[PDB]
Amino acid sequence: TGIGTASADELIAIADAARGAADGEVTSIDAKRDGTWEVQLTTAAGAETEVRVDEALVASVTSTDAADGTGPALTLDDETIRALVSAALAEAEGMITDLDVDGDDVSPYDASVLTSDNRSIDIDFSADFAVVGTDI
């Protein structure tokens, strides 16, 4: 794939990840061909560790709104995210920026595509994943 990075900041992040999984100072950062990195740490003594370092996602709660006093009928289960992402990218090419199942019940799903133009396209979909609305 596109193995490697041009970012000192990323390499430093990868050194830092490894630095907290084992003792010793960093003596090698190496891109494996899957997408992961191997970092070698090395103690004053000469003890070598090898640390795998992967892209992770960390999730922290930001807000909260207790029960108004209805759950959701539909949801962004894995099926549903994959449908919307095709449907949306078919209708307009670019980066997906928003998916929601909030909607207005006859258009239950929404996606926002961002485009080279830096022009946002708010797309509206039927329960059956057909385009029913655009806003460019």
47 binds a copy of itself (CB under 8 A): yes
Question: Residue 132: CB partners within 8 Å, gap ≥ 6?
Answer: 106, 107, 124, 125, 126
- Coil, helix or strand at residue 12: helix
- x/- site string to U ion, residues 64 to 93, per CB under 5 A? -x----------------------------
Site residues for a copy of itself, 12-41, by CB under 8 A, read 12-18, 20-22, 25-31, 38-40
101 binds a copy of itself (CB under 8 A): yes
Q: Which helix (H) or strand (E) holds 32?
A: none
For residue 107, the partner it binds in U ion, a copy of itself, Zn ion, none, with Cβ less than 5 to 8 A by kind, is Zn ion
Residue 96 backbone zone (phi > 0: left; psi -120 to 50: alpha; other: beta): beta
- Coil, helix or strand at residue 13: helix
Kindly list the distances between the CA atom of residue 7 and the CA atoms of 1, 55, 58, 91, 134, in Å, as whole numbers in the listed order. Answer: 17, 15, 21, 34, 38
Site residues for a copy of itself, 63-92, by CB under 8 A, read 63-72, 75-78, 81-82, 85-86, 89
30 binds U ion (CB under 5 A): yes
Q: Could you tell me the two tokens for 5?
A: 């990075």
- x/- site string to Zn ion, residues 43 to 72, per CB under 5 A? --------------------x-x-------
Of these, 100, 130, 135, 136, which contacts U ion (CB under 5 A)?
Answer: 100
Applying CB under 5 A, the residues found at the interface with Zn ion are 63, 65, 77-79, 103-104, 107, 110, 122, 124
